[PDB]
């Protein structure tokens, strides 16, 4: 504490930093000689200063974004000579929604796809990949495929524009979708014709063309291809998929705070977690990423089907009795939701 | 098929305030009261009305034992936010068909009753509110 | 854990007017009234409403032993000056969990009875009042 | 210090009205009711109140044994002049602390009973009336 | 930080006109209005004012009880004179922080009631005027 | 969406005027209003607006405390001065999504209220004006 | 014939404002006024008319949540440019035949308000314009 | 601000005094006699005045 501080300080206009954004947490893997472990990122300026110019490129890279800048990016340094499962096994502890590797080999490629459907599909995690040129059939994982990208004189690879894809993906609001969103920072990409790009898009590829005097996504698609009866072409958009992740996410999240071994498994309780979800799902259909009018209720199929498979007499039982039967530690409950998509083809007819 | 006793019992009632169980509950009531206007018509004798909406209203007593609203509702109250609740009423009469299960949400009260005592009389609490939308579980 | 041993009796309370203890106390009330307006918003067909503040109302009925009210407030009255005061009510029950004691505050008489007698009739006095304040002590 | 021996009866009362005593008096009772206006002070949720005045109320009931109120008061209501009486009310109890004695001046009466009987019902009288000013003998 | 204590009530006001205390009192007005003049310049959206002049307006209502006005102003507007009148006004509220006493100087009245009455109604009288100026003697 | 919770009440307003805070205020307008000159075009039906200027206008309402505004005009008024004044408007609701802080700036009053009571009546003081300019500090 | 339930429920409406959503709105207006001149002839005692012309008027209300005129109007009229705004209202009782969409082009609002509250008060805004254009999107 | 009755220090005073505290309710010890001693406890909030302005311009 000292004097009383009065100071006026005259100095120049400074550039305007883009906004920020609420969600949307990257993945870095990196490869260089120092500053090994995890590293945090939530404003370009502070970047560890012994990094190399080329990982700092492809960090701001990944920093550029979109509308908003990523909400936060984690980077993960290793030396070098070290098993990209490493840095997976890591990486399974945090939490983030998409990872992109500037520099994998097509052993490092299989590895990290089979790391992610295994995630999914297994570890009950929704995660998301960007890949230079993979053929997986998994909406998890997104296939980007375009060579040689030129940025101020710059010539960068497929897989090293993966962070700038990432980076815009994650920047895009909940309500738009990547469909047509322009590269002001591209200046050129090798020629390509229509028919191709087309064959491309219903192949699964993410890519950039040239139209209306300038390079934009041709379509926001996943790399999904093989489509069943129960999964359907819905699952192939990513603005989908990514709504679905975080309402998977946040029921999970509540579902395991506040009933996972903490309430007898009485009936009571599975009515007072049924008002919970459901009031869950209203707030998410007043902030209109969701319709109107869902359900939420208990699966009287499913627990019919696990009591009888218990062995227990169902004849002479009423609707009543087996709704409200014990059935361990198990709960079985159904919903029904509706989601909507942004608008992607028109078509015009002009009578002169 | 009608018989007395089928008819339901009031004893057999349990409610469920803000997620927690309250055993002192005595009665339990809720309602909607549409709002209707009248219209007369050319030509028709007998006049016609038109249905705007509805208010939801109801009540809740019970024995006087711990100070469950004041906790609720009373800092809040002064400090100029008011909380909303959820409300479910359970009604399972073992000689009934089944049970009658219903959620009331956006529950605003009334009042906060501080004090009230007279000296040879048991203590009880009267908690009117207001709410706006309900969900329907295990009807009959 | 509910059992009808827990329910508080008004025979255990007792009230502090003033700093002066009270012997000849009946009963006491205090009461918080919120005020609410109704709300219609476009596509809903329930009606909200919005909190915008509480009256505080409140009685005490008292045994006619003494002039405690006049002395409290006549001379006063009549000058134009209107005093305000502080009670204390305490609710101890030995059967139940716990004790109760609020202390409400500012309070503004409603009226003064000077004389009422019948013959045949004990003698009671009610005095109504008013307050905007309180605190909570002992809360169970 | 409180028994119940204390409490005032009403059948220890006496009224003196006009300077005479009356010895048929059944009841006797005077109040103050206050004048507030509600006052809403920004940032304060409780509404406060300010005090403006108050008005003097009161009644006599007795037994009809003489006509004492219509020569009171009846033909100078006719003429156009009205008359204000001085009523002087005592209770003085034998188990009490003490008595309480107090006059009601300015008193002007609200009505004048001629005639009112049924068969096989003893008469009775009531008479309404207000004040503005007292004065305090004997207080407790 | 106010009070509702602190509003002042109209019943402790007092006025004197001409040097005499008038006790039937039942408002006075007095308020200065101020005159303005639009400014408007070519080239500029806004619009401005600047002040012109004053003038001074005031209104008294009194009960009927006897024939003040008509002695006040006797035959000096008959006569072709020019009468003037000076006013006090006090405010003093105890509960307030102080009084608040104003002389109006050069009062002018309107009109002159010398009759208006109806069977079954109490009589009052109203008196406009408009004055010059105007003293502080108290200031709250 | 809307919630019927986040109306704003204006009780949660506050106001400065000349960098005093005002405690006693009831309500506070200020609003701009617009000119418009109608186009009219030979052989074509419709008619149209063009913007010609602006003007600012509003009042302030406060409870009689005080001789608040007395002290601020004083005798500037009298003298032949144009006093101006700058006031400040906020309006900062809990349940609200944020506050709303307003500046405005070159007041001038239309008039100055002396006396205005009545017997039983409690005071008030209204006061309008006109302004040219006006800042946001807090937006929602 | 008609019926009851056909008469549109004004709770059913919507407002898109330069193509955003108001959540907030309370009613909206929009009418198109014709011009007459009289024709008389010497000789006839009827009076004739032909049309002249046509003007647009209209009003919004809106419940007070946020500051959405200001940022709509922002500095374009203080920087005496001229902006027009496009309107879209929707009526859709589920009772009634259909839907109602209209679109209210070049309007030009008539004032705006800063700041308008009182204590104790719930705040609205009023928003009165003139148009020139309007297109019909769905007929009932 | 607010004003309350010092639980803790009474506790400990009432241990001191070699008391039992097991199977006692907390109202229990919270009435419980201190002889003579009185414990409380209290908080407030008090404002600084302005001494350091710090004005960033932008030319």
């Not at chain 2, 009665?27 to 009261?33: H, I, L, V």
Request: charged share 30%.
């Amino acid at each position: 504490i000292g004097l009383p501080s009065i100071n006026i300080s005259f100095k120049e206009l400074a550039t305007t930093v883009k906004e920020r954004s609420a969600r949307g947490i990257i993945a870095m893997v990196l490869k260089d000689a120092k500053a090994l472990g995890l590293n945090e990122i939530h404003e370009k300026e502070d970047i560890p200063v012994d990094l190399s110019a080329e990982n700092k490129e492809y960090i701001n890279l990944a920093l550029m974004g979109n509308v908003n800048t990523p909400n936060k990016l984690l980077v993960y340094v290793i030396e070098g000579e070290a098993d990209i499962q490493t840095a997976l096994d890591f990486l399974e502890t945090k939490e983030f929604n998409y990872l992109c590797m500037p520099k994998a080999v097509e052993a490092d490629k299989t590895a990290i796809k089979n790391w992610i459907i295994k995630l999914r599909d297994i570890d009950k995690v929704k995660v998301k990949a960007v890949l230079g040129k993979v053929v997986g059939n998994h909406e998890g994982i997104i296939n980007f495929t375009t060579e040689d990208v030129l940025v101020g004189e710059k010539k960068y690879s497929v897989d090293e524009f993966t962070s700038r894809v990432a980076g815009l993906i994650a920047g895009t609001p909940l309500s738009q979708s990547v469909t047509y969103t322009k590269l002001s920072d591209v200046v050129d990409i090798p020629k390509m014709t229509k028919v191709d790009a087309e064959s491309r898009v219903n192949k699964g590829e993410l890519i950039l063309i040239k139209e209306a005097g300038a390079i934009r996504i041709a379509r926001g698609v996943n790399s999904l291809t093989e489509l069943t009866a129960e999964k359907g072409e819905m699952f192939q958009k990513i603005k989908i998929v990514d709504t679905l992740d975080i309402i998977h996410s946040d029921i999970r999240k509540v579902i395991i705070d506040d009933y996972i071994g903490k309430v007898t498994n009485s009936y009571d309780n599975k009515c007072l977690l049924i008002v919970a979800i459901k009031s869950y799902l209203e707030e998410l259909e007043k902030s209109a990423l969701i319709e109107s009018d869902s359900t939420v209720e208990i699966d009287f199929e499913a627990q019919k089907s696990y009591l009888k498979s218990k062995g227990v007499d169902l004849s002479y039982m009423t609707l009543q009795e087996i709704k409200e039967a014990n059935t361990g530690s198990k709960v079985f409950l159904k919903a029904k939701i509706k989601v909507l998509d942004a608008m992607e083809d028109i078509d015009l007819s002009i009578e002169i | 098929n009608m018989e007395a006793r089928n008819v339901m019992s009031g004893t057999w009632g349990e409610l469920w305030l803000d997620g927690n169980k309250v055993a002192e509950v005595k009665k339990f009531q809720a309602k909607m009261e549409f709002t209707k206007e009248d219209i007369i018509i050319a030509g028709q004798m007998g006049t016609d009305t038109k249905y705007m909406g509805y208010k939801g209203k109801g009540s809740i007593t019970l024995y006087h034992v711990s100070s469950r609203m004041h906790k609720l509702i009373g800092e809040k109250i002064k400090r100029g936010s008011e909380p909303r609740f959820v409300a479910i009423s359970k009604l399972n009469d073992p000689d009934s068909y089944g049970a009658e299960r219903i959620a009331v949400k956006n529950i605003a009260f009334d009042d906060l009753t501080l004090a009230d005592w007279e000296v040879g009389v048991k203590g009880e609490i009267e908690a009117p509110f207001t709410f706006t939308e309900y969900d329907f579980l295990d009807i009959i």
